[PDB]
């Protein structure tokens, strides 16, 4: 599979960002795309071996790509702008211009902001199952709510007894803005975990809601007196109740 | 090996020396076009063929794959280098010689390998630059090449010409003389 | 004498009896050795030499790569042949005949014609002469024209009319050029 790093990147405007792509072994053609939504696949540049015959397609001269080794490629966006925010996709194939199957990577979601002032981490809270639900259907649904975060770079996961779970989980596929009218509104996200009645009624079962927030880094400087909204994990736990 | 017409829809050449490459199409032994890999444009050798299009990026990406495969074969063959062949040079006129009439001197340089050669014209003790042209390296069945150089001239009784050929298979530059007779 | 490593790729199409027979043979060459080829008649890669064995192994294991090669006969050879039917296969250049005394020898120069098919006969007083003729091989000028010279071992007398007879697909009727002393 094609590898890409980093998975997320939130940066202030004017900073340089560097995207990394690891093509499939044996693929000498490598492609760069970027994708907004709602928007389609926007072609950027491609490499045959270590050379890029097609330098056009780049949005501006601030974009530059390299594949010096003939394998791993890097895309650099100097002095980022607001319009640079997108999901940058990488692909690779046997060969270029041969209609070879192009295989994509996970992408890098880039978000560029005018200022970092409205950046804030999420607030996580777990909600214990309803007493009426446990009596009526012998099933316990607990809801997690991550609220008050900006931008929308969040990954929510449920952890039962120290092991991540996927069965019985449904998270909202897309965060919703708390103030839909405002331009720079903050976000909120919900998720549900449903387990059996006997599993919840067990007081020795541990339930934790984990939210990965992508924000600033140790390189980024912070001026406010509030907490530096750094890339962090915010959790909220609850125990079984009898 | 036997057909009515044979075509090379892609004569791809890459060599470590320059490093240099060449991309051409051939039909019945003649150069249809070449791609200037530096200028990234298709140069057609036959006027009737200018009505067509060929994306030079096909040539540019083709040569980049050859650069890859060449490094692979260099390694696999324990750096087995190319053998220098002795080229064969013959000079002749495009049309019969008439002292008044314009003509074209043809210098055929055959059995070229590796495809690295210098072809220059000499008349009466100085090199000739005006009115000389060259074909690209044309492919051969035995995977050597030949190359042809032209010199437009106006034959004169006292003007003799030489075709100077420089190749690593030659221990000294080969000169083929041509006399108006 | 510098060292050089050369790689060649030839995508060759072979046409016979119009479009009745079409064959694609893509040759991968290291130096002057074809190491692996894709012949459309077999439909898969075949190593020609020991060095091309790893390449044929790898390519034949990729169904995607095998797909495009099998379609290249249609995508490349047949597509381009339709372009050739309206261009190079339409090219007709009338040969230019010229007789020049060399008397006891006579040279009929057939210059600047295309395509290559040519037929040259000498005539002495309506009687064709075959016992005293010697012809050079077919000469490729490299500029999409050919030429051929037919010498004639003759013995002149008072009243002789020597005629050169040339046939070419560009001609509705053969060309005749005479020479008298």
């Amino acid at each position: 599979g094609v590898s890409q790093s980093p998975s997320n990147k939130v940066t202030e405007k004017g900073k340089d960002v560097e995207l990394r792509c690891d093509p499939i072994s044996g693929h000498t053609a490598l492609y760069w795309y970027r994708q907004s939504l709602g928007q389609g696949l926007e072609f950027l540049i491609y490499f045959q071996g270590n050379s890029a015959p097609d330098k056009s397609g780049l949005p501006s001269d601030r974009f530059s790509a390299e594949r010096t080794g003939g394998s791993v490629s890097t895309l650099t966006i100097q002095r980022t702008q607001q319009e640079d925010s997108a999901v940058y996709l990488c692909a690779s194939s046997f060969r270029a211009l041969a209609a070879d199957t192009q295989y994509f990577g996970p992408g890098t979601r880039l978000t560029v902001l005018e200022d970092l002032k409205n950046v804030f981490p999420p607030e996580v809270a777990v909600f214990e199952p309803s007493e009426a639900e446990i009596s009526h259907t012998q099933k316990a649904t607990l809801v997690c709510l991550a609220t008050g975060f900006y931008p929308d770079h969040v990954e929510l996961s449920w952890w039962v007894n120290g092991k991540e779970v996927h069965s019985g989980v449904c998270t909202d596929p897309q965060p919703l803005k708390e103030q839909p009218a405002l331009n720079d509104s903050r976000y909120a996200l919900s998720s549900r975990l449903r387990v059996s009645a006997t599993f919840w009624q067990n007081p020795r079962n541990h339930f934790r809601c984990q939210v990965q927030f992508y924000g600033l880094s140790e390189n980024d400087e912070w001026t406010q007196d509030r907490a530096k909204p750094v890339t962090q994990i915010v959790s909220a736990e609850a125990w079984g109740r009898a | 090996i036997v057909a009515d017409h044979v075509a090379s829809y892609g004569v791809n050449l890459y060599q470590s020396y320059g490093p240099s490459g060449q991309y051409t199409h051939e039909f019945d032994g003649d150069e249809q076009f070449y791609v200037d890999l530096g200028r990234k444009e298709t140069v057609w050798s036959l006027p009737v063929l200018r009505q067509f299009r060929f994306d030079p990026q096909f040539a540019l990406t083709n040569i980049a794959v050859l650069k890859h495969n060449l490094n692979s074969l260099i390694k696999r063959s324990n750096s087995t280098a190319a053998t220098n062949e002795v080229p064969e040079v013959t000079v002749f006129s495009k049309s019969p010689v008439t002292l008044g009439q314009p003509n074209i001197l043809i210098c055929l340089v055959d059995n070229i390998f590796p495809p690295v050669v210098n072809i220059t014209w000499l008349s009466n003790g100085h090199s000739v630059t005006e009115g000389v042209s060259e074909t690209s390296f044309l492919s051969k069945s035995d995977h050597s090449f030949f190359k042809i150089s032209y010199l437009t001239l106006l034959p004169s009784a006292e003007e003799s010409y030489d075709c100077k050929v420089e190749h690593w298979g030659l221990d000294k530059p080969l000169l083929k003389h041509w006399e108006p007779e | 004498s510098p060292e050089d490593f050369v790689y060649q790729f030839k995508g060759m199409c072979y046409f016979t009896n119009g479009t009745e027979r079409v064959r694609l043979v893509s040759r991968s060459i290291y130096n002057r050795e074809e190491i692996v080829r894709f012949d459309s008649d077999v439909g898969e890669f075949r190593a020609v030499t020991l060095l091309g064995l790893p390449a044929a192994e790898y390519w034949n294991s990729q169904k995607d790569i095998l797909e495009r090669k099998r379609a290249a006969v249609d995508r490349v050879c047949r597509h381009n042949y339709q372009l050739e039917l309206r261009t190079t296969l339409q090219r007709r250049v009338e040969p230019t005949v010229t007789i020049s005394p060399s008397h006891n020898l006579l040279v009929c120069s057939v210059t600047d014609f295309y395509p290559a098919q040519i037929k040259v006969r000498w005539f002495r007083n309506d009687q064709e002469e075959t016992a005293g003729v010697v012809s050079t091989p077919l000469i490729r000028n490299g500029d999409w024209t050919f030429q051929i010279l037919v010498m004639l071992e003759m013995t002149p007398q008072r009243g002789d009319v020597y005629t050169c007879h040339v046939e070419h697909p560009s001609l509705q009727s053969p060309i005749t050029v005479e020479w008298r002393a």
Partner: peptide, 13 residues
């Protein structure tokens, strides 16, 4: 009308 060309594929390193 566009001319079509055969394409070589990479191998090894």
């Amino acid at each position: 009308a566009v001319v079509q060309s055969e394409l070589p594929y990479p191998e090894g390193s």
